[PDB]
Write a protein that binds this ligand. Structure first.
Ligand SMILES: Nc1nc2c(ncn2[C@@H]2O[C@H](COP(=O)(O)OP(=O)(O)OP(=O)(O)O)[C@@H](O)[C@H]2O)c(=O)[nH]1
Ligand SMILES: O=c1ccn([C@@H]2O[C@H](COP(=O)(O)OP(=O)(O)OP(=O)(O)O)[C@@H](O)[C@H]2O)c(=O)[nH]1
Lengths: 1082, 394, 15, 50, 99, 49, 99
RNA sequence: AUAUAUAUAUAUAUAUA
RNA sequence: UAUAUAUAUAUAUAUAUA
């Protein structure tokens, strides 16, 4: 393996002492080689206990090194002091960067010394600069200095990659060495006593700078990383938006030669149309003012790149312009104070001189859309609106509530804020009213939360009480169903692939058509959202209170009206210093259940009005209006060909007419491409944002290092597929430090390639990128059962809370409200849902995961001896694999590439077998009980509970079905027709299609039903054993791509799988689960 | 606007090609109609509102009685039913007819659905347009699989290069009337050369514009599903008596697809100005026969019709190329005639035809030799020079 | 600055 | 379809005594429920009277 | 004038453009504001007082802008419009509503 | 066609604001076809009716 | 498909509904007697007690229409389905017998 | 002695005295 | 002489988006 070779040179770099030793640990599937592994590991612990070498021992036990596989590498290091600064002065050659002070409009966001920015010790909030990743700066500088000594002696091409990653390191190292490397605590939080003399934003600058200089490959990358590393030391605020500004304009200049398209039922076609790009002179005057704001900010090598591209305006050099936009978001987050983020957001200027003739049409268009979404589930009395108190409470999001409450659960009292834990307390103390929702007014205001965006100003968010979730769950779950059957709302075009969903932009683009994409400056706190948006919905629930006749569908529709009356005036609770500031804010509340289902109504019903007022001058015929919250486009098809004046006079008539409703906007029109989400259609080729901060998190999580090392790799493979190539030798160096564990003092344990890359709970990174590899060899399926044996752990906090008198009083009050019977297969099935729902609490899931890893250390310091006969996914593929016969085969390049930023070893698969044409849905069949229970009751049972029901008596299935609420003639038509007997073979087959994934980070892009992959896969057909047929044609279609990515060549399989081995595998596929299947092997 | 009395315009000389570049110039006609195949491909309007292929394969499995999943490589009936290859077959059937670029079928013999839906190409597109080494291997594969196992006769003893196509033989060797009335239309389907409005363009038959030729086909292959198949087993019958009934159930949509192609080919035919000629080209633009199956049973109820700002652009580029072609003949014959009449015996005219192949934007100089460039001068030397250039050299 | 459209240039020879 | 809530308790305490399970005499189909029989009986009568 | 919130809800429920057989385009009711009815009163008198030839402009895929074209031709005298648009509105009415 | 009574009353107005504005016309009202045409939208005529 | 006839070309907007055009094209007697009742099933506008209300046909209140349908749904199940395959015949004859 | 809303896709993991 | 029917399991974490 390649990763093990990077391990044994990382140890020889960080521990350059003669007192240091490395002890490899080995394991094997053989019972004979295991005793070869026990004796070898014992002797290296006795010989290295008292100063004896290992070169005389590795020859004697060379029967175990070349045959068994590496488990871990133990590290002895009697080094008292970290030698980071001792080898930092070797690279600290350049002049130190002096910070600037006149570049920011605030004081704390400037780059001042922390002694001058915070006067005393007690008012030191690190939450403006905190990287909140579980690594350090001292560990990052060892990850670059390891790379800068391995690639010192290089060939004449790879030297220039090393040289450009060195002059960008002397900018970093000569600034850090001037103030010294900061020393963190054990929680990876930079304290005040170390940051007394260091400049503020030195950790989050040098973390965002090291992420950049491990991505500098070409000279086009070096001019960007030289003018962003120097500048991000000075202005932390304006820099991320000045560079990322013209990419909203530059998407409208490129021509269309041959573009993709998606037809009406969402499937992919290819089109060949040639559409000119028509931009007026007021775009090249708005682009020159976007290139003079980048010259006053100091940077001068970026607008020379753009102005050398504006004379071309060609799609061949647009991968350079998408690279400049993506490097802008890597400067780090824009975190600021909670007071200045709200008070700059909650400040808005309303005006009584707004056009009231346009609001009474905008209110009515919200009225006629809310009625249109609920006219069918209210006229027919639906099973989910009649149970709004229960379906909102039984499926309750457990993220957070407003305040911190002292919850007492039996003996163990806990300070929690989770939302379903507040429901358990108030249902125990009786202070929980089902039909009364609390008023958010000048008394009891709304608390606040924040979300940080890598380039945007820090925004606020609203945390409503839990009684504003039970009132709004059942109605808005009926509005998301209509948003998946309408061509306008963007819950419809939401699939796995991105060419299918955002490819209806280029359906109506021609030379007589004009696309129109507008982004409101702030969708919250607009004038058209305070009064005319609530009173359009309250009117829609007056016409819906006349549609039905129940006392219970009206009552849930008089609660969803009461939450809009109470939010017409609102107050936010934000503290500062010692005073609490209550700010009136009657606008929309980003943070309800309603905040996306009613940002697609209020923005469609707004743009259906502003497209009506511009039709007094230009007569057109609109084709689609797709809307996604704020971000919406609307294609307009004209009579004449679109010229340079119809583009200018529509962009002046959509901007001004939006200003007639006091909504400040910029209105951009083009004919070639838009920027709807961060996914950019440019010239018929979808381009992505590609900015994910590796070494900077927006907030500290509920996860450990072994899980934050997986999201460092998962944020890299998304960064690589989207066009931002970070060096794999740096990501692998950063996994060998995060997965480090200190057993005792001066002893670190490092797992090998087989512990991290195997398919289990403890997975960090794949061996070769973009592909999953299920290792079918006997030394690798044997360790998968060793890791699948300890994943089932119990946490003592979740079992002290599950046996309390409060949690049992919540399940028994929820089981009594649901079922009007006695049965305990639901009370034992509801209580297993809220025990699973309490994993969102932080010390519960941390004591789950720490009991996973601390039990892994007992497995890694010794050779593994755990032998078990469990059927895994990796045991199915050991029986299929010897019956494949490979043969080399040639396959031409037919289809066109649609994403130019993809890597070369992925783009060659797309050019040969094609991008995905349609989203494959092969999930078998749902059982006939779950179509009978989910249609009457709102209780969705797990499929391991519906198998437990079927294996009961005939008279105990009928008692269970009548228990939920099913009538007697419907259960007796179920049970009497013996279709409970057929559902044994549809539950057990539902775990086969769940098993293997045709979607991944990379596998979504390809077409798996292509007529060029079906030509290479040559498998003979057997009529029976249907479960085996699926897993043969899926594993064969995955084995060719997993070979054609690694080596760039195509192979053609042949699986003459015999009839005697299919029936042995048919019972292996039905015995993965832990339930009684009728057909077993032995 | 209504233009005043003192407005003038420059009329471009659009008169049909005077070199006859389709006659013995086999390599220059390969890339002068590749150029008109790509341009017509970017104009022919693309199919929106197709039947979704998840809701069409899963109905094609309930009908063929196959346990065939969505991901199983079902190479007998269900391979390659995409939607990218549904718009593609619509485009390379319309734009190959507008440029007279001869196709070349590519298929697999053991895929019985691509032979059922392959019976629809030959009854719509005239068979003088598929290449003959791939028309014969597709007409023979239909005969020895679907038609000759229907009436139980011996499979066809066809040899290579026999000057009769295998549909031209099996209308004499067959005894039925409904499948020798359709099989006579396929052997006698040809473009009809009519000179309309100054240009020669090749209209279809009137029974292909109506869609009535499908009513000669779904009356033929309805009777073919009533035969007993005596020499074949029970399973070979019920495999392809079920496969030929997937197409006879789409008789409503295939009589609307033949009207769509023959109308989308009519209005795009009006926007061309160069004299289109039906001469077999060298390099053939390949049509996968799987893509015809993706067109015959994936379309429904949604008329596409080319919006007239792609007719006014396909016309304004066939005037700009045809008037750049003609005013580079006249700039070159005026030098060849004025060099021979001035008695320049010591000058060779390779360079002034090398400019003529260069000002025409589509050709390349590094491919044409000095024998396809002096043979071209021998045609230019015999043309009469333009009157504005003759009265100024005289 | 891009080349002007043929429609906007030929209302300008008129105007 | 319709009966009171306590009759479900009144029919559960004697269901194990009097085994009447296929008295309803119907072949089941997927997509058949009794809440749509009660619904289609009401949208056939009330769409005729109005 | 008649309020815009009233006439649109009677015009978008009598036409019912959303529930039509065609779904290749998003169809809604456009241009029934109170600024175009105040602008067609200014244009249709001032282009009639000063003898300036009006010209029509529409999209023919909707018929509610074409049915009201019948009122325009019966009041404004037909020699006012430029003839290649008077033809292309009278032919547009005939080939989709009258014939 | 149901809006008849308020549309007899529009052309009585459209031909009265023409009729008494034409009395303030001293220049000769010659009628010939002009080059540039003031464009009228039929989507703005379906608002006046 | 039960009688083996060719499936009908029914264009959009034909004035004859496809039961009123398949009682003329079909040659049976019992399934052409049910298709005559569906083509002439109408409300009977009578005034009763001063209130005009639309009573149903007298055979529908009796129940005798089902004995006209199930007499026609039985002859259609004893047919051979000549064009279609046998499993399509087994898919209707299993479902037409549940009724 | 300890703060992180809602929705949509996607992936990983899990159910047992 | 004969080879069955049917499209939205749940929970937490993670990233992309609004
Ligand atoms: N001790 C310790 N080592 C870390 C930590 N994070 C990373 N390291 C590793 O330790 C090296 C840097 O030395 P230190 O951070 O001082 O760790 P140390 O050598 O054990 O010395 P001490 O921290 O004083 O215990 C880096 O190369 C990392 O591989 C940490 O949080 N604590
Ligand atoms: O975490 C989030 C993000 C967004 N939203 C909802 O999405 C809406 C649109 O999100 P945008 O990011 O488009 O808002 P914006 O227009 O204010 O952005 P800038 O121009 O200032 O860059 C927001 O106004 C809010 O309603 C949330 O509810 N939660």
């Amino acid at each position: 393996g390649k990763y093990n070779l990077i391990l044994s040179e990382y140890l020889s770099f960080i521990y350059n002492s003669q007192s240091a030793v490395q002890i490899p640990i080995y394991y094997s599937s053989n019972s004979e080689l295991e005793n070869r592994c026990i004796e070898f590991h014992s002797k290296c612990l006795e010989n290295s206990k008292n100063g004896l070498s290992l070169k005389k021992l590795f020859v004697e036990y060379s029967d175990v090194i070349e045959n068994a596989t590496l488990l871990s590498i133990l590290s002895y290091s009697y080094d008292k002091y970290n030698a980071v600064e001792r080898k930092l002065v070797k690279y600290a050659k350049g002049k130190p960067l002096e910070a600037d002070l006149t570049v920011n409009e605030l004081d704390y966001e400037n780059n001042k010394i922390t002694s001058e920015l915070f006067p005393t010790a007690e008012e030191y909030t690190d939450l403006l600069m905190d990287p909140a990743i579980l690594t350090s700066l001292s560990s990052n500088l060892n990850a670059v200095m390891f790379w800068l000594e391995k690639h010192e002696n290089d060939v004449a091409e790879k030297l220039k990659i090393y040289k450009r990653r060195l002059d960008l390191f002397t900018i970093v190292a000569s600034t850090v060495n001037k103030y010294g490397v900061p020393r963190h605590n054990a929680k990876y939080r930079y304290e005040y006593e170390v940051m007394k003399d260091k400049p503020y934003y030195l950790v989050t600058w040098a973390n965002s700078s090291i992420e950049m200089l491990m991505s500098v490959f070409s000279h086009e990358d070096y001019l960007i990383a030289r003018e962003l590393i120097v500048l991000s030391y000075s202005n932390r605020s304006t820099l991320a938006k000045l560079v990322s500004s013209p990419m909203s304009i530059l998407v409208a200049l490129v021509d269309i030669n041959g573009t993709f398209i998606t037809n009406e039922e969402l499937e992919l076609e290819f089109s060949n149309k040639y559409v000119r790009a028509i931009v007026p002179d007021q775009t090249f005057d708005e682009l020159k003012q976007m290139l003079d704001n980048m010259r006053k900010a100091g940077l001068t090598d970026i607008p020379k790149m753009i102005q050398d591209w504006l004379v071309d305006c060609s799609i061949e050099k647009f991968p350079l312009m998408a690279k400049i936009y993506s490097w802008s978001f890597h400067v780090g987050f824009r975190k600021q104070k909670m007071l200045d983020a709200a008070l700059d957001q909650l400040k808005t200027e309303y005006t009584e001189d707004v056009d009231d003739e346009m609001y009474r049409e905008y209110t009515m268009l919200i009225r006629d859309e809310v009625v249109k979404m609920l006219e069918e589930p209210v006229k027919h009395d639906d099973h989910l609106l009649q149970d709004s108190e229960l379906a909102g409470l039984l499926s309750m999001s457990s993220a957070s509530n407003g305040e911190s409450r002292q919850l007492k659960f039996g003996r163990k009292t806990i300070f929690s804020t989770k939302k379903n834990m507040h429901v358990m307390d108030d249902m125990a103390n009786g202070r929980y009213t089902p039909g009364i929702i609390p008023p958010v007014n000048v008394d009891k205001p709304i608390p606040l939360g924040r979300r940080d965006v890598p380039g945007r100003r820090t925004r606020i968010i609203f945390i409503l009480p839990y009684e504003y979730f039970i009132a709004q769950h059942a109605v808005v779950e009926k509005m998301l169903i209509y948003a998946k059957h309408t061509r306008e709302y963007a819950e419809f075009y939401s699939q796995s692939n991105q060419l299918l969903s955002y490819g209806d932009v280029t359906r109506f683009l021609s030379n007589n058509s004009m696309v129109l994409y507008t982004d409101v400056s702030q969708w919250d706190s607009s004038q058209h959202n305070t009064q005319p948006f609530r009173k359009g919905i309250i009117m829609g629930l007056d016409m819906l209170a006349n549609m039905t006749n129940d006392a219970r569908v009206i009552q849930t529709l008089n609660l969803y009206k009461q939450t809009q009356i109470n939010l017409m005036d609102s107050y936010v609770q934000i503290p500062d210093g010692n005073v609490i500031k209550k700010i009136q804010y009657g606008a929309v509340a980003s943070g309800e259940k309603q905040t996306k289902a009613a940002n697609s109504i209020a923005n469609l019903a707004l743009i259906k009005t502003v497209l009506s007022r511009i039709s007094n001058k230009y007569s057109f015929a609109t084709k689609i209006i797709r809307v996604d919250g704020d971000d919406n486009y609307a294609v307009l098809q004209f009579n004449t060909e679109v010229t340079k004046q119809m583009v200018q006079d529509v962009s002046n008539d959509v901007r001004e007419t939006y200003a007639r409703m006091n909504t400040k906007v910029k209105a951009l029109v083009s004919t070639v491409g838009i920027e709807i989400a961060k996914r950019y259609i440019a010239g018929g080729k979808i381009f992505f944002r590609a900015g994910i901060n590796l070494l900077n998190n927006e907030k500290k999580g509920q996860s450990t290092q072994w899980d934050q090392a997986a999201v460092l790799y998962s944020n890299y493979i998304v960064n690589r597929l989207r066009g931002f190539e970070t060096d794999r030798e740096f990501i692998l160096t950063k996994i060998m430090q995060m997965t480090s564990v200190a057993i005792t003092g001066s002893l670190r344990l490092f797992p090998s390639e087989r512990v991290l890359t195997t398919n289990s709970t403890f997975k960090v990174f794949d061996s070769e990128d973009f592909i999953i590899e299920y290792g079918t060899t006997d030394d690798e399926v044997y360790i998968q059962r060793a890791f699948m044996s300890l994943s089932s752990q119990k946490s003592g906090i979740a079992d002290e809370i599950a046996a309390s008198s409060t949690f049992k009083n919540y399940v028994s009050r929820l089981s009594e409200q649901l079922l009007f019977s006695k049965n305990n297969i639901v009370s034992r099935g509801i209580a297993l849902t809220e025990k699973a729902k309490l994993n969102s609490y932080a010390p519960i899931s941390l004591e789950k995961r720490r009991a996973q890893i601390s039990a892994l250390l007992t497995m890694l310091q010794k050779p593994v001896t755990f032998k078990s006969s469990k059927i895994t996914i990796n045991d199915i593929l050991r029986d299929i694999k010897p019956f494949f016969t490979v043969n080399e085969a040639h396959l031409p390049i037919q289809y066109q590439k649609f994403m130019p930023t993809l890597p070369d070893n992925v783009q060659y698969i797309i050019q040969c077998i094609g991008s995905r044409t349609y989203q494959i849905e092969d999930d078998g069949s749902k059982s006939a009980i779950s179509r009978l229970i989910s249609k009457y009751s709102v209780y969705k049972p797990s499929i391991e509970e519906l198998y437990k029901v079927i294996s009961l008596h005939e008279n105990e299935i009928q008692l269970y079905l009548i228990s939920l609420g099913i009538p007697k003639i419907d259960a007796d038509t179920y049970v009497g027709s013996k279709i409970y007997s057929q559902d044994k073979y549809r539950i057990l087959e539902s775990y086969v299609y769940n098993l293997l994934s045709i979607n991944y980070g990379c596998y979504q892009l390809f077409d798996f039903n292509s007529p060029d992959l079906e030509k290479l896969i040559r498998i003979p057909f057997k009529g029976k054993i249907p479960a085996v047929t699926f897993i043969l044609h899926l594993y064969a279609k995955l084995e060719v791509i997993n070979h054609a990515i690694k080596n760039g060549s195509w192979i053609s399989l042949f699986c003459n799988y015999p009839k005697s081995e299919m029936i042995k595998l048919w019972k292996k596929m039905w015995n993965i689960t832990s339930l009684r299947s009728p057909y077993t092997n032995a | 606007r209504n233009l005043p009395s003192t407005a003038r315009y420059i009329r471009p000389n659009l008169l049909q090609d005077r070199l006859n570049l389709h006659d013995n110039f086999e390599s220059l006609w390969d890339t002068i109609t590749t150029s008109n195949y790509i341009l017509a491909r970017s104009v022919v309007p693309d199919l929106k509102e197709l039947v979704s292929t998840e809701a069409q394969i899963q109905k094609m499995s309930q009908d063929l009685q196959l346990e065939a999943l969505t991901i199983q490589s079902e190479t007998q009936f269900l391979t390659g039913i995409n939607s990218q290859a549904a718009n593609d077959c619509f485009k390379t059937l319309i734009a190959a007819m507008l440029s007279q670029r001869t196709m070349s079928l590519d298929f697999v013999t053991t895929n019985y659905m691509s032979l059922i839906s392959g019976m629809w190409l030959l009854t719509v597109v005239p068979n003088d347009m598929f290449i003959r080494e791939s028309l014969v291997a597709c007409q023979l594969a239909i005969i020895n699989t679907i038609i000759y196992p229907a009436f139980g006769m011996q499979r066809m003893h066809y040899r290579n290069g026999d000057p009769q196509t295998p549909f031209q033989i099996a209308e004499q060797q067959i005894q039925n009337f409904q499948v020798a009335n359709w099989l006579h239309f396929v052997n006698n389907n040809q473009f009809r050369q009519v000179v309309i409005d100054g240009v020669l363009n090749q209209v279809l038959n009137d029974n292909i514009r109506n869609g009535h030729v499908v009513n000669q086909l779904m009356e033929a292959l309805m009777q073919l599903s009533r035969q007993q198949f005596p020499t074949m087993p029970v399973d070979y019958k019920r495999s392809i008596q079920r496969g030929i009934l997937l197409l006879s159930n789409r008789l409503g949509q295939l009589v609307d697809l033949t009207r769509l192609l023959a109308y989308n080919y009519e209005t795009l035919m009006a926007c061309i100005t160069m004299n289109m000629q039906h001469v077999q080209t060298l390099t053939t633009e390949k049509l996968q026969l799987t893509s015809v199956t993706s067109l015959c049973m994936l379309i429904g109820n949604a008329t596409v019709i080319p919006s007239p700002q792609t007719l006014f652009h396909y016309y304004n580029v066939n005037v700009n190329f045809h008037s750049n072609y003609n005013e580079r003949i006249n700039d070159a014959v005026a030098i060849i005639t004025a060099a021979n009449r001035l008695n320049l015996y010591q000058k060779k005219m390779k360079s002034i035809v090398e400019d003529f192949l260069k000002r025409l934007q589509i050709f390349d100089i590094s491919r044409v030799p000095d024998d396809q460039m002096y043979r071209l001068r021998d045609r230019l030397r015999l043309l009469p020079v333009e009157i504005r250039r003759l009265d100024i050299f005289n | 600055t891009k080349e002007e459209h043929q429609k906007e240039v030929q209302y300008e020879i008129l105007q």
